[model samples]
Target chain A: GPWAMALTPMEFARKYNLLRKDDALLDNPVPGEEMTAGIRRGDAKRVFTMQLGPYWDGFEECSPQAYALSAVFMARMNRDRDAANNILKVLDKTFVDGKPDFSVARPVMKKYQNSELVQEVVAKHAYVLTVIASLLEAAREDGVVPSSEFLWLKPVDRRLWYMLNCVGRQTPYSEVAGPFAHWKAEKEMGRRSLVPMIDEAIRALEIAVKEVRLTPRQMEELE
Target chain B: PWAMALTPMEFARKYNLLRKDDALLVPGEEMTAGIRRGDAKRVFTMQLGPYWDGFEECSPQAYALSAVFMARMNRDRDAANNILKVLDKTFVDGKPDFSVARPVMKKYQNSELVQEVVAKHAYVLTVIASLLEAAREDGVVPSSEFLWLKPVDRRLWYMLNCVGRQTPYSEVAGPFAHWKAEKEMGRRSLVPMIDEAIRALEIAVKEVRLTPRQMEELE
Candidate 1:
């Protein structure tokens, strides 16, 4: 099966520290909780929508929301428009007046993009900004929404765009030239931006979307 | 003059004002003087438009303030003073409370190096903005080509106005200015930020199709 080819149960357990040799309560999965391999059906759904809210909530916290915001954009681009809207509804509650929250981002970047950990964290999630930016441009073609709605995205996008090179460390050329090389490599690979890759992925996902097709029961879980 | 041909919107878009949604009010006379003299301080007050969050809020003010700092970097105190005067009007309301604009102005006020970097950044941003506009006007979709300067335009805008505002001060040069003001600061010898800006600017300058006089004026 594809699952077996992807990863063995023992391999997954070893990789994620899921089990012990003596099985002395090393880890426990809730019994009869619709567990399949390592994923409980609902757990996968939760990660898709909120990206493990409590784990991110416990750690610095902003990163989770950032990831959520990014997922919204990715989901929309993946042709899951309804899912994107659903995630935004949650974000509306998380941020006042429907805005992207950055309270955690501010403290972590207090050193103004100088702190190594701060840079690392921001860069790790930088694809969110780039994805959203691309979405904005694509959306502009049809004037889907007002520009001001996305104005806040600019500051964060710009911040990440500039700081990407210097993430987690410092050097002159590393910040600028590093991105330049990636850009060049992407061009060499025959794509303008990641649009083609994203488009292809979205097409592939359409089949899965059709297969599972979000039953009413599963849809209710998102709410 | 060459100034006559460039409309406020075109100029603003060239300098990032279209997104700001306000019109330029300063006369061409003041604008030319401001640019030639590099006195962004003086240029700030010449605006007759409605307020849009004060300085650094829009393309015009940001560019004006940047020009002042650029003047300073170019070693023109006279220009810097003129540019600084533009901010005086805001202060005339009796030493305005720092709390009013501190959050906004803090980035520029904290370090002298910021002014210098921003000035150059605005300069580069304006050029890219202008070139992008011109390409659009000419029925040229920049993205359709591999080398029509789309990447450079996006990168420069982010570096100058968005993400890389502090990049020059921190990444390229050491944070000596970031620490405290001193009589002399260390030289910003070489860095990727500067090189990247120059690289982006070089492409714009080459492909923008300027007339000889315009080229001279740009130089």
Candidate 2:
């Protein structure tokens, strides 16, 4: 009876006019087929695991994949308390009362915060945050205000998803999390060989941190 | 230390910066004062952020960069604000909705005043973005918001160690930066490719709390 409130990758393409077809992240996987307002019937079930790859291929191929990357930034801005809680819960799972190793394994940020340095950081960076927050607000207020409701960050249940999977624009949380959770489950009964993966995770964290805040040299100019 | 400078219109006129009549562009004393709109298009604009050598090209990147310039150069926030309020009126006047581009930009896209203010949207976005990068080291905002940084010649781009804000950094560097740089090179000022910024804000909005449908989707 009623038409669906539809949004499509092409909608983004024309609205932004950011990149030409040649500059897409991946080539269109549907061969001669064009992207439609809705996913075709076989588009999802036909490819199974590979379906996400093509779906994302459609999503990323439209632009420089900048839209997805921007999503993760807003994700970080919203990550404040839930992130801390997630870490605490994870640390708690590995905690042990023995030698206070596990007892103090989980700690806090508010009461233990630095005074002057904290104040200085705020003085130096708060307005910058306000700028980013404003730009972000304005950007969303532009083209995508309507489609915002259909998609969301779902941070409450997907804490680790934000930390790890959001970094990849190739797949959404539902698609990436399965393999991630599988890799995560690798710490079965006796196998503790997540060290390599853990190392990569730490490296990702380091590289990712530079996205939102001012870099060292950037701070020097303001200083 | 606070720094402020007063320019003699004679100095400006002879130097080709400001004419005596431009004094009308000067802000008044009240905090909520209004700047006369008669010549705001001429006076408010300053060829700012990026280097440009065109006549009548005064713009500090629209009302925003102009606002900041007045605050920094003139050391007068109220005066700067007065200029901004006039521009706000210029867009829709008599106190309009100034938050989003819809009420202002989309509506007034044709006016010379609007065009002058929007001229530096891209440049201001870049510097403010560079400012965000500055805020990162202080530990207040996280460093996860980057998508593009043009090194900024002074914050535009230096072509090395990049500060790499562009996404899928390698492809974007190859796919995006060169094209973006050409825009900056050829143009006096830029209207921002704001899709990325908007996408960031959209994600931020959805992340903060569930929108009505988002919550409904959860149900």
Candidate 3:
């Protein structure tokens, strides 16, 4: 374990620049000769190890945008507000005159179809929207400038409601008999709980993943 | 116009106010009664015809109020009629109890004719008893009149409010289409009134980014 003892998994990934500072995998160059040297040394001793070793292929294929969004979600759930804030700050820097460059996420998302990978991509997009909504609410609480003011919350909110309602999840308004009744109920309910909403979306994504037929290698990548 | 004779029966039937006995009158022997009836007040006033002429310029307001009033009548005929009677009696002196000093109406509130008519009709009694009752406690009317709105107006209101978010269209195509239909029908004044309301609503929507305190007020 000579080479392995020399660098921890995080260190190895960092040395090769394969991971973002937030520990999210970056869709960058694969580890090459100089980078693989330590891994090779560990391999010779039959002690190869890496935190990302199991899911390397999947993370390698995932767009950095998606990966970063996932990291943001994890940070939020972990109550690491500083980490989440850092990630969002970097995200804002990448925007071109306010519009986010979804170029990377678009190609990566479309590359896979009718498979667990596709669901994962879809899940990532939904999670991204959910996180943005929560962040908007947070910024409002912090008295941040009207950053979310120009954002179109309805379409995103409607899309999430559509997905949940259509998939038999029975959103808060579903039990009502008509639109009027639904409105009355919703007005009474007021602002909805975002955490549980995101959790249910994640559960829906997980269930979709379970239905796809994965190969042995793909199964290993997910594991 | 001969074409005008057919409108009254159609209007009467549409509003469910047609009487078989009235249909047999001597004037109906040759469609003469229907001809004398003017445009069937299917879309506006029927019983209180001449009284509505003074308010015809703002007919949609009249229609909206009559629609709500008719709804209340459907629920309790005697109670609705009594309310209408009191409302009529309240406006005799060209002043009404509901005319609070709305500084928001500064432009129109002071114009003599505007003040007299607005007070006389109590703003066309647009604050129907049910709507008034709903807002009695908190002064925040629920704006729950989609049932009486045209299908297009109903959809637009829902789309703007996102109450259910279940409507198929993600935009205001239906609302604008209905606006076009009304415009084409020579309802010039009505269309602008609706357009103004929509413009106000569109602005309100932009300000929907609510804080915790703001959201609590909504609930």
Candidate 4:
């Protein structure tokens, strides 16, 4: 009851969107203070596990770019399994979402792997693994990490492999089959209903995602 | 602008669809006024679009009696042939260097030299009938040659037109590649003309002579 009274989730979400639109919420967040206050107010060990799972799933379903962005989130958050699962989830979701939202954003997002612009942006993060590996090495040197801890980092590496740069979704016709292929189909069909085509791509992505295994936490993320 | 409004005879003689030469005859966004206007006895001609020949820009009427002759040929082939003979006799004129119009007309309209013959030609229909009759008598050729293209080749051709070689084919195959291979087999089992029509389309496209304005826009 007390938790609910402090700040309604809806109000929090509204404020968050406002911040996102204006690019200000992340700049000055009271959440860290609020969490500290909550803990000082006898809410320590709260360690609240947010249901970010459904959010990413929904975003992926709505917009593939968001789905891909979620993978970046999971990677940044160090949710090893969730990162991998969410990466695949977004790939399927956005690929499928292509038809319904034939906007410019959709095509840009649709090119998850092959975009030259996206690749360059991802290249900046190339040293992230090395840095992360160094941290692991330090942890091992200090004997802070358990023995055989390096193997668990494999899923993190794999999910990043799929998201930043992997190939094989080559379309048949270079001109007509990419994101703009629907334009040709619309011209041919005498009508524009691109939603179904996106749905088609989503299904293909779903199949690809199923090939990967998920940890318990990843299962929770998917659920 | 002096160019031929290709008659069906010229289409037959050219061994392909006469694209620029018969833009007025071809089906387009609207019904061709020249074909539907019912003024069948007049000459019909227009300059070829520049894409065909890059020499000069001209839009002159290239034929004199071609339309009247085509209308006659469309209505009654034998009668038109008889009239052409009479005109040729007049051109003879008991002189060595006479008017060359007869030879030009003959060259333009003659179907004996080219091979884009439609099966609708009475002569071709008769030949098919005779072949079927001969097959029945001497067991030479398949009698199925007499089968109507309406129920058979019509559907086949329409499928090829809509889906066989275009993006619709790729789109369909992308969703369901298994059925594409099967459809290819089924298509092959039918007439070779369906495939021939697609291959022949390249020639028709090549002959689609464009005008200078259109050529500039294309560039």
Candidate 5:
């Protein structure tokens, strides 16, 4: 079975060196205490809810959440064109900034299209950026920025989008997305406002376009 | 406008060529033809991009830069390529013996620094070959299937750019002048150089793309 191959101990050792620990785990964690181990150990339960804070957190944590939400929304909207059109109009008016309102209303819009509960909690939570930001910046100085600054931009009119490829020496999309989804559901006030959030999102898009523009050849390859 | 110049050695070399002296390095007609087709500064200019000088000293970067010095080695070849008509004004027979100029040629050519460089220059030639093979594979080289610029010349142009004779700009909307000085400073040539190296590897390293069947076996 040399070519057909079994993972002998020696071969496993060699493969271990090639294995990307970061793609498997973000950072070195205390054994048995990391979220990955907890999830694997069956200590974590799977639950589904619609909320903005958790979704934002999960999107930042990994690209998959945004993809999942985008995919789910797109699928439902495509099936019911008329209903999707109505919701898109309402969202376009409500989000107020240049952010992708269609992407934001995607989750509940999909749910509503199928005659399910509007999942208003998730939809409203997604829009309520002020709530999220205040919670993130609680008990801070007048101009202090909390770690949650990564989610939405201040004094700008956008929220985050396409938030993948922020992988680090260890951060993989696996651990990033699922937990991030859960975090978005937590009712955080300062973190939930629309204006500053959308501003940050625009800033992120601008930065991404700028980076791509500078390295046309590399961007061509990546594309 | 067409331009051609010949030294006494050039005329004698041609005479030697007609004499069919196979031992001579220079064939009179061939060498004369080669000079006609050699380096053209007008047609092929350098684009010295950023991060060129950032190369590790004496590395491929230096080797590439040094290649420019030997750039005109094939200059005579280019001269012969131009569509020009010339009279057979047979000035004289063979290449004149430049034994008198040999001492003078050695003044620059045989100096310790020049000798060291000239000797080390072969590495530059080999590197240009490596770079060309890679550039071709990556499809980054803008040469036609056959009429593209030679690797030897291209590598010389790259050297000129790296040494700051020409400026590199992103393939973005702007030309060299249109580039933002700050943006140009960071990621111009480095991206292409590194990319070209990777491209060369893909061509040089002959690894087959794994088919599903083949992949299954590995899996």
Candidate 6:
């Protein structure tokens, strides 16, 4: 028998602030290419499912705009889900006889993809991803941001960027205010932390967003 | 601006919280007329107007003094009575001929008018007191008056402020319909004066950006 020292899961997650629900690793994990991802596949899948809400629930095929929004989220999440599953399938496909050698790629191949509970393991992630894809793709697609010092923001803020623009097209004060209000609360509660640049963007954006309404609220209350 | 335009009663009646919807002018007749009855002790009658009117018997200076003498009466009070008698008898639509009251006023000026501060008592007391009637509407009026405002009358007033009565109510009401749906209860304006203060503050605070310039300007 052979033994090797390995990191416990908590140590792995904490090292990069991965405990955050919106961490980049939770959104986009590439076990096929990124460093150490080959070993971290199991951990990445565990966290990914936790943060993403059921993209299908609570949605009614109400209006064109709402349907469009639903399509956008569904397609976005589908691509992300498929990528994670594919990587896990490859690495855990087969194992070598004894050592670190796979018959081909490594000393030993672990046939993790064939685990009897694979369905049960991924069952938590099972969701109807097909319908909205047709709707969005049929409608034909349309399109985050980076700060200067950090070539761009991490995927977390980038996701929010997508979320904002997604709903921003509606261009109503109520529409934009809904999510930003929640995010503002998130930051206050420390659920979200931002770099000064993005925080400044959020602060100024919130102010600008509010100016449109308060002048009007003033007029409404002018009596 | 609201201070200039909305007398406390006009503001209350505006939301239908005051006396009588029948004739707009009846409830405020004394205020608009700028004259109220006086007693005969060489005392002065209350005089008022929407704003300063030197042309009237009560000039602004006299109005201020009239307010002051409300608390004291040392002289000229009899002269004030004499002058008002002549003016009252000579009155046309709204005033007495200046000539008729001038002599008595001058005679008393050095003495009773000046010393007693009699003319000083001729002023806005009646109008100020009338405005207090609005409080009566809220605290002591019939309960029906209290109940009627929360709905129909105040909603129209709220829309007047929003669309403005320059700004036709129905025309723009459609555009702002989304906002209109979120009707904050019209009666929640207990501190609306403070809200107006914030409206002014918001205007001033962001004006630097609207018309920004040099450091001196910014300063």
Better of 1 and 4 by TM-score: 1
Best by lDDT: 1
Docking tier of model 3: it is: incorrect
The digit string of per-residue lDDT tens for model 1 on B1-219 reads 000123222332244221211245333222121121222112221211222232445443334444444444344545444444433322221221223333334444334544433333223333222223322332422221111111223233222321223322111111212111111223222121222322322232233343444334432
lDDT of 5 by residue, A1-223 (tens): 1012223322322233311122233355445322221011111112111112333332224233233233333334234444434543443233221233335445543454333222323344443222233222221322332212112111122222211211111221221222233233334442333322222222222232222222334323321
Which candidate, 1 or 4, has the higher DockQ?
Answer: 1
Model 6: how far is B5 from its true place, Å?
Answer: 26
What candidate 3 gets wrong by more than 4 Å, as runs, is: A1-128, A142-223, B1-37, B40-42, B46-119, B122-219
Q: Give me the overall lDDT of model 4.
A: 0.26
Provide DockQ values for all models, in the order shown. Answer: 0.01, 0.01, 0.01, 0.00, 0.01, 0.00
Provide the TM-score for each candidate, comma-separated.
0.19, 0.19, 0.19, 0.17, 0.18, 0.17
Tell me the TM-score of candidate 6's A chain: 0.21
Candidate 6 reference-contact recovery: 0.00
Query: Candidate 5: lDDT of B96?
Result: 17
Which tens-of-lDDT digit does each residue in A88-165 have in candidate 2? 333222221111121221232222222333232223221221212222333343333211111112221122222232
Per-residue lDDT for B1-219 in model 3, tens only? 001111223333344432222433443133121211222222232211222233234344333333333324234334333433333333221222222212212323234433323332222222122223322233322223221122223332333233222221213322333333333443322222223323333333333343445334331
State, as a TM-score between 0 and 1, how close model 4 is to the true structure.
0.17
Q: Any residue pairs clashing in model 1, and if so which? A: A158-B163, A159-B163, A165-A175, B39-B83, B41-B83, B41-B84, B41-B86, B42-B82, B42-B83
List model 6 lDDT by residue over A1-223, tens digit each: 0111122333434342332222243368645322221123334343333322233332342222233233333333333323322332232221100111112211111222223332222232222221222223322322221111111111213332233333323321221222333333333554322211123223333333222322333333321
How large is the C-alpha RMSD of every model relative to the true structure?
24.6, 26.0, 26.3, 30.6, 29.6, 33.2
Once superposed on the true structure, which residue ranges of model 1 sit more than 4 Å away at CA?
A1-62, A89-94, A97-148, A154-158, A161-181, A190-223, B1-219
Q: Fraction of true inter-chain Cα contacts (below 8 Å) kept per model?
A: 0.00, 0.00, 0.00, 0.00, 0.00, 0.00
Candidates in order have lDDT scores of: 0.30, 0.27, 0.29, 0.26, 0.26, 0.27
> Which residue segments of model 4 deviate by more than 4 Å?
A1-86, A89-223, B1-219
**How much is A118 displaced in model 2, in angstroms?**
21
**Model 4, DockQ value?**
0.00
